[PDB]
Symmetry: D2
């Protein structure tokens, strides 16, 4: 039940974030998205803020004041094996996937406490429980955030705020339909039990559910939505 | 989207299984429940079969022929420390919570393959990831079923059938409001971050979601719905 | 420090169980092994008892009275897709890999409590956290025993008894060098980061360490020994 | 078998790090320890470097050139609930427990590859799988490092290098015998199944084992050494 709730979705001009904004809009929430590309944002049909999170967080906090539902999401950082990654690559990933996210929570959390209701949902990756061999930066940075949000979930629970992650597997975002060949996309598709990648709305729907009033007893969890790919049984 | 899908819910005259039946009925599914007590079943307002998961299941298969959605559920076996449990206690738990469930899946799975759609959802316990010290029989039997359903999820994924568990924490079922004093209830309730037990419908709605067309890319997963109690971070 | 401790190792005429028996013997423990094949046992150079892990229980308890260290181990049950496995397959695996093990523990446990010192070690499989797709019977039965032992580990901890599993990955036992071609062997080997299967002693040495006095604060854990194969981060 | 291997242990003038250096010295390794406190280090009887690792990595790499075995370890960061922690608290923890650690590995890893043998062991905490409610900064930073090392273990495995964490539970270090009252110590002690905290050597021996030639097929693992405290069963 999310008619009239305030929603912010980060990195939401395209891909999963976009799909999440779309759903929540169709279920009557008042949604703001934010991203780097203004042109993409004007075309989205949503309320938007142009927001490079490294440089200018106070612009975001000024233009989007309070928020019942917060979906954390980011671009994926550099892939590579250990010798082709610098200290700067790990630092940038930590800043943008972990420390900047903490700042954003810290900002919007007090109004949720005051209302006695809230939702935080972080979009991470199934690579969190089934680490991919060349994603050193995002593996470790998403484990970081996932730990932070678990510890958080304990403290905010009594205020009616849930805190969860959704860990999508391979998703057919326009970004992925460019980072990969047809040969590589087939090979990967063939190791997914469902023998396909997710439509972005298939990830969106899980996130929309955790945001609804029906998910009120579910917190401190990472829901993996990956077609059956990861092997971990519990 | 589950108007007109055939649904069977086990151990569903009371508690969580009852709530699950109620929801899916409200969303337009054709629901049959089954349990031991016929008088409870007559009063439930649902299609029913009298059935016992410690014994023969043939009556069940005859009276309920095909099924799009199958929710596995049972009564909780005996609690106890090791010296106050017999080999029989372990065997009865294994038969009822594991082997008889495999036989039920075996039975309704073929018609799901034939249609290219299906859903299997097992209601287990948060004790599976956060084992309670005197639940030796249910801990180990629920691990067994979880292990079985994960292995299964791999195989049936390409047929459009998902396989998941919902692992509820402390829930205010009539059964629990009788297993426990007031003193023990408050002690428990004070260790749950949400500071309360779940209404049965709070577990129901998660199950109901996994059963919908929206959960199409989510399989092989145990969703813990426990108010934040279990500490495991992934 | 295990000079003169009494040891029983199951399924130990060949493979990993044999390697465990040999180590513990070299470190001065008085070791009994047990298995079906009497001529293999005669030739092993160890104290032995002939036993099935189905019928022959109280012969074992008769000929092997008390034991400081108990290594549980069994043959691997039938591998297969769901439609090529019977109710009897699941039932035999649960009896031999789970309920018979509970019986053996129940037997040898009282004398460990009496002495204030004990060691139980179950050899299971890395398939426990990274389930292989057609090992339905072993996956679920090993999860069952792993769950049992974890719950157990809580209760026997104060009595100076540790309870742990060792989960070996692909090991070069002569059984495996027969279950597999050269082509299948290489395919598998090339997905192990160490690019090879374990010598049986490389699993044995882990088991031997859990059995030593030095492992005195480590209980309720499954050590995975798999050359890096399983993806699970925690 | 580690007679003559070169060993470096960080944060090792006291506590667990100290205990690890002691053992490995007794087994014939040539050990250097490093910490901030020079006077403690002189008194240790070991080879030592003094270093605030924010600013003396150049010193450390200079005075300790190559190393077969690398035990990563750090002081514990600030404990607190979310409102009493700043962005600098999170930053400092990430720096010191994660990004500095990567820099050290990056340094000592090439000579391990060149020799075809090595060991990296991080001492983390059982709070990684059983997160404590007010350790936001260490929980999330240790998850980061654990995720980093697991991703690394895949790549370095073919080179004869293992990568593991040891996650001690409550240990009777002098530092802990000061952070806690008697009253709080006993409450804690009474929730550990073993009913006591670890002697630092009891965590040291697990580390020493991972460092030996006998742990050759064991990598990509976090061994939890916690007297049975954490409930996670797998
Ligand atoms: C959690 O999850 C479960 C909660 O179940 P619930 O909320 O539905 O409890 P509940 O008792 O409130 O309702 C479950 C139903 O199961 C039926 N039942 C009990 N044993 C059965 C059996 N042997 N075979 C067939 N039916 C049986 C009861 O008659 C009851 O109607 C518990 O096992 C607990 O551990």
């Amino acid at each position: 039940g999310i008619r009239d709730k305030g929603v912010l979705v980060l990195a939401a001009s395209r891909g999963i974030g976009r799909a999440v904004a779309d759903v929540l809009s169709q279920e009557g929430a008042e949604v703001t998205i934010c991203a780097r590309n203004e042109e993409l944002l004007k075309r989205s049909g949503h309320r938007y803020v142009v927001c490079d999170l490294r440089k200018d967080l106070d612009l975001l906090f000024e233009k989007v004041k309070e928020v019942d539902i917060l979906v954390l999401n980011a671009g994926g950082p550099k892939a590579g094996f250990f010798d082709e990654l610098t200290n700067e690559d790990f630092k940038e990933a930590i800043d943008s996937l972990f420390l900047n996210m903490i700042k954003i929570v810290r900002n919007y959390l007090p109004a949720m406490k005051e209302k006695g209701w809230g939702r935080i949902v972080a979009i991470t990756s199934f690579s969190v429980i089934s680490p991919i061999e060349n994603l050193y930066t995002s593996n470790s940075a998403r484990m970081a955030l996932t730990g932070f949000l678990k510890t958080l979930s304990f403290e905010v629970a009594p205020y009616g705020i849930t805190v969860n992650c959704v860990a999508p597997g391979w998703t057919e975002t326009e970004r992925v339909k460019e980072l990969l060949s047809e040969e590589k996309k087939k090979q990967v598709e063939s190791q997914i039990p469902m023998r396909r990648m997710a439509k972005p709305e298939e990830i969106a729907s899980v996130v929309a559910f955790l945001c609804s009033e029906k998910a009120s007893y579910l917190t401190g969890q990472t829901i993996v939505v990956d077609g059956g790919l990861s092997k971990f049984p519990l």
